[PDB]
Amino acid sequence: ANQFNSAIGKIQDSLFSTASALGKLQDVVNHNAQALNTLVKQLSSKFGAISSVLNDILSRLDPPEAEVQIDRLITGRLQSLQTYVTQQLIRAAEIRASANLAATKMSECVLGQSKRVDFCGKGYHLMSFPQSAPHGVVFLHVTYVPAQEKNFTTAPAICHDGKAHFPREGVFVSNGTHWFLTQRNFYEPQIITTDNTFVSGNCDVVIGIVNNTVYDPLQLELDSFKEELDKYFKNHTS
Amino acid sequence: SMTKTSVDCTMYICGDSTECSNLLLQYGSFCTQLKRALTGIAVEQDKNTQEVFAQVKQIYKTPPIKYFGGFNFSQILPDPSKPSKRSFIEDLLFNKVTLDLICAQKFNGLTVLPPLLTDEMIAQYTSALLAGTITSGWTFGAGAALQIPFAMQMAYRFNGIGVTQNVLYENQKLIANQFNSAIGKIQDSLFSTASALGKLQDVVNHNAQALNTLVKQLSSKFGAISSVLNDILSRLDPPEAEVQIDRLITGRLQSLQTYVTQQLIRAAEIRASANLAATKMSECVLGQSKRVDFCGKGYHLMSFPQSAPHGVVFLHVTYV
Amino acid sequence: SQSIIAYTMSLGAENSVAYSNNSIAIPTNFTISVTTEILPV
Numbered sequence: 029a030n031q032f033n034s035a036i037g038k039i040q041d042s043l044f045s046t047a048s049a050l051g052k053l054q055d056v057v058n059h060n061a062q063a064l065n066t067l068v069k070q071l072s073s074k075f076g077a078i079s080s081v082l083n084d085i086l087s088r089l090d091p092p093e094a095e096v097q098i099d100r101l102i103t104g105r106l107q108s109l110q111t112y113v114t115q116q117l118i119r120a121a122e123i124r125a126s127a128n129l130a131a132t133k134m135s136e137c138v139l140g141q142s143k144r145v146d147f148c149g150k151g152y153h154l155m156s157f158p159q160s161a162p163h164g165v166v167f168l169h170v171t172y173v174p175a176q177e178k179n180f181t182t183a184p185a186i187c188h189d190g191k192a193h194f195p196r197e198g199v200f201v202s203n204g205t206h207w208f209l210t211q212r213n214f215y216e217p218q219i220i221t222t223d224n225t226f227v228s229g230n231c232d233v234v235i236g237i238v239n240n241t242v243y244d245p246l247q248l249e250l251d252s253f254k255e256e257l258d259k260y261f262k263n264h265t266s
Numbered sequence: 267s268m269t270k271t272s273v274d275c276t277m278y279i280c281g282d283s284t285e286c287s288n289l290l291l292q293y294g295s296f297c298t299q300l301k302r303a304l305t306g307i308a309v310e311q312d313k314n315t316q317e318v319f320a321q322v323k324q325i326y327k328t329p330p331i332k333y334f335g336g337f338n339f340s341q342i343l344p345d346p347s348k349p350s351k352r353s354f355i356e357d358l359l360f361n362k363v364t365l366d367l368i369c370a371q372k373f374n375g376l377t378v379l380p381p382l383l384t385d386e387m388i389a390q391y392t393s394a395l396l397a398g399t400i401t402s403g404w405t406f407g408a409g410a411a412l413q414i415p416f417a418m419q420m421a422y423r424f425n426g427i428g429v430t431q432n433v434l435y436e437n438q439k440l441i442a443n444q445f446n447s448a449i450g451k452i453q454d455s456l457f458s459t460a461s462a463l464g465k466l467q468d469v470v471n472h473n474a475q476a477l478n479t480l481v482k483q484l485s486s487k488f489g490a491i492s493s494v495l496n497d498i499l500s501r502l503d504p505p506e507a508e509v510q511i512d513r514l515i516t517g518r519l520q521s522l523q524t525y526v527t528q529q530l531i532r533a534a535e536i537r538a539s540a541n542l543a544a545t546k547m548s549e550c551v552l553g554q555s556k557r558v559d560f561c562g563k564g565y566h567l568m569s570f571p572q573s574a575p576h577g578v579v580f581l582h583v584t585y586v
Numbered sequence: 587s588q589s590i591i592a593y594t595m596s597l598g599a600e601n602s603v604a605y606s607n608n609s610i611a612i613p614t615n616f617t618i619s620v621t622t623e624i625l626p627v
């Protein structure tokens with residue numbers, strides 16, 4: 029909880045200080061404004077006519093002579109409009125791709141937990157939270173990152189009684205003297221036992237199999253119970 | 267990625283002609299737009315490469331001893347006895363896919379910008395991804411790289427596809443031999459069976475065709491007396507010359523606009539392809555994918571990247 | 587005094603994973619990381 033609170037408190041700084049992203053939304057706004065400005069600035073080009081103002085041409089010429097200038101202006105402005113609309117269509121295709129990606133991220137990072145690597149942030153995705161931004165969305169991805177790794181000796185299998193034992197879920201580790209079974213993403217060593225291992229074949233197949241003791245809880249419990257039974261017997265029989 | 271190009275309107279349309287440039291000023295900011303679009307395309311190409319390949323925090327190296335449980339990675343590991351430490355497969359790819367027409371294009375305002383990452387840096391990135399994925403598994407993609415023996419990593423992956431790891435440990439030599447046979451057949455089936463590897467060549471061919479057509483449209487009169495600006499300027503007074511100059515300006519403006527629009531559409535397609543390649547690098551190379559047919563046909567075990575001219579090659583190792 | 591300099595790109599730090607026949611690195615801690623992804627809609 030404390031680590032999450034620290035990270036969510038650093039978000040309010042790193043969102044606007046480290047930059048990186050948040051330039052995509054501003055870039056969208058700037059591209060739209062640039063397109064509109066260029067479209068309305070193309071109205072000042074004569075395109076070969078005597079003037080760029082329709083009222084001027086209409087006032088300074090008879091219709092037969094005016095149509096030539098009017099047609100030059102029509103051709104230029106038609107071209108400008110066509111260019112604007114084509115660029116808008118290409119940009120809208122790009123934005124639709126981005127919005128489809130954002131919808132998939134909302135479905136798979138916010139509404140669930142994702143196993144896809146780096147889809148919902150760097151690390152093992154825990155959850156995600158949405159925030160709305162001008163013309164877009166922001167995903168706060170909460171992920172799990174392993175921190176303090178340590179060396180261990182490891183074996184693929186353990187040989188105990190001429191049988192090979194494999195971890196049910198985990199790895200065999202050794203600090204140098206003893207062998208434990210640990211989960212692969214967090215060092216929580218446990219005694220190797222018939223409960224957390226399964227037997228498959230003999231020890232002559234696996235390359236790298238090591239000798240160690242696999243403890244049977246049934247046998248140990250039976251021996252401990254038989255010790256108490258022997259004490260209870262000797263209480264009155266002997 | 268695809269080739270970054272830069273076009274000079276004044277040189278392409280009114281090459282070193284002052285009268286034509288003064289007439290071209292009357293069409294507004296069409297060339298500011300064309301230049302801006304091309305610059306966006308080029309910056310996007312560099313972005314595409316960066317997103318696909320710069321996916322490793324560090325440049326991981328394999329240890330000097332190249333034993334990985336019996337597996338033959340030599341044909342995909344870097345070759346230090348070379349100027350660029352490209353692998354065997356990477357060098358085969360770069361030799362098969364190969365990038366006067368070029369001089370003539372360069373002679374009228376049409377230049378080609380070099381990519382920001384050289385082939386040596388792309389090869390370095392691919393080598394770092396390979397070393398990370400074979401010396402640490404999928405741990406380097408989610409934090410610091412944690413070393414693990416390759417057989418035990420393969421047992422992890424067998425567990426990930428639903429097979430118990432004793433099946434790998436008791437068939438380790440057979441699995442290694444099958445992998446070595448398949449990775450040895452890759453060097454033939456990559457250039458003999460064809461199928462793909464035509465996409466990169468198609469990209470190169472489309473770019474070259476676009477540039478050739480753009481520079482060949484300079485020979486069209488578009489209704490003028492001649493297609494050479496110097497000829498028109500030498501054979502006519504200015505008042506009579508402006509008509510031919512304007513016909514040529516209109517035709518060449520149209521050709522440039524068509525080139526830039528086609529480039530924008532193609533760059534959109536290539537950006538989609540590069541986003542797909544980046545997702546494949548994240549989910550097939552940096553981890554093990556449960557998505558069906560995303561990382562090859564079969565139950566995905568692992569994947570290995572190789573760099574190719576203007577693209578990437580994924581060797582998907584799957585269980586069938 | 588500051589000045590404009592040119593250089594070759596560094597692709598990142600140089601790391602050699604201590605791969606061995608029987609060595610494994612296991613994490614003993616963890617970090618909760620909240621990252622941000624901005625997407626135009």
Ligand SMILES: *[C@@H]1O[C@H](CO[C@@H]2O[C@@H](C)[C@@H](O)[C@@H](O)[C@@H]2O)[C@@H](O[C@@H]2O[C@H](CO)[C@@H](O)[C@H](O)[C@H]2NC(C)=O)[C@H](O)[C@H]1NC(C)=O
Binds near residue numbers: 187237238239
């Ligand atoms: C793993 O153990 C086997 C079997 O040895 C038995 O179990 C041991 C735990 C210990 O209690 C031994 O005294 C037991 O005999 C080892 O195989 C033995 O290898 C030695 C040396 O080559 C040989 O003289 C014995 O005859 C072998 N015993 C059998 C039953 O084949 C094996 O070497 C041990 N593995 C490792 C990696 O040391």
Ligand SMILES: *[C@@H]1O[C@H](CO)[C@@H](O[C@@H]2O[C@H](CO)[C@@H](O)[C@H](O)[C@H]2NC(C)=O)[C@H](O)[C@H]1NC(C)=O
Binds near residue numbers: 331332333606
């Ligand atoms: C890991 O173990 C393998 C064998 O299981 C070692 O490979 C052998 O190395 C020795 C010298 O160290 C050579 O004489 C053998 O020919 C090698 N065998 C094979 C099959 O290649 C390997 O050196 C060990 N160490 C590391 C760091 O991988």
Ligand SMILES: *[C@@H]1O[C@H](CO)[C@@H](O[C@@H]2O[C@H](CO)[C@@H](O)[C@H](O)[C@H]2NC(C)=O)[C@H](O)[C@H]1NC(C)=O
Binds near residue numbers: 338339340341
């Ligand atoms: C790993 O692969 C390489 C190449 O695929 C093998 O090297 C070949 O070895 C044979 C047998 O000596 C030679 O005839 C070939 O010329 C070698 N090829 C090359 C390209 O050098 C290598 O033997 C394999 N390693 C193992 C341990 O099997």
Ligand SMILES: *[C@@H]1O[C@H](CO)[C@@H](O[C@@H]2O[C@H](CO)[C@@H](O)[C@H](O)[C@H]2NC(C)=O)[C@H](O)[C@H]1NC(C)=O
Binds near residue numbers: 030031175176614616
């Ligand atoms: C796991 O990591 C956490 C986070 O770094 C460690 O908690 C820190 O412990 C130090 C030493 O007591 C304190 O000064 C810090 O304030 C703690 N941080 C937080 C956020 O509480 C923790 O000790 C680590 N666990 C182990 C076993 O090493």
Ligand SMILES: *[C@@H]1O[C@H](CO)[C@@H](O)[C@H](O)[C@H]1NC(C)=O
Binds near residue numbers: 177178
């Ligand atoms: C694991 O061992 C290698 C070899 O000594 C060492 O370089 C590396 O730092 C170790 N890793 C940790 C986390 O201690």
Ligand SMILES: *[C@@H]1O[C@H](CO)[C@@H](O)[C@H](O)[C@H]1NC(C)=O
Binds near residue numbers: 203204205206
């Ligand atoms: C390995 O861990 C066990 C469990 O605490 C301990 O008894 C043993 O001494 C440890 N070995 C070393 C070398 O620290």
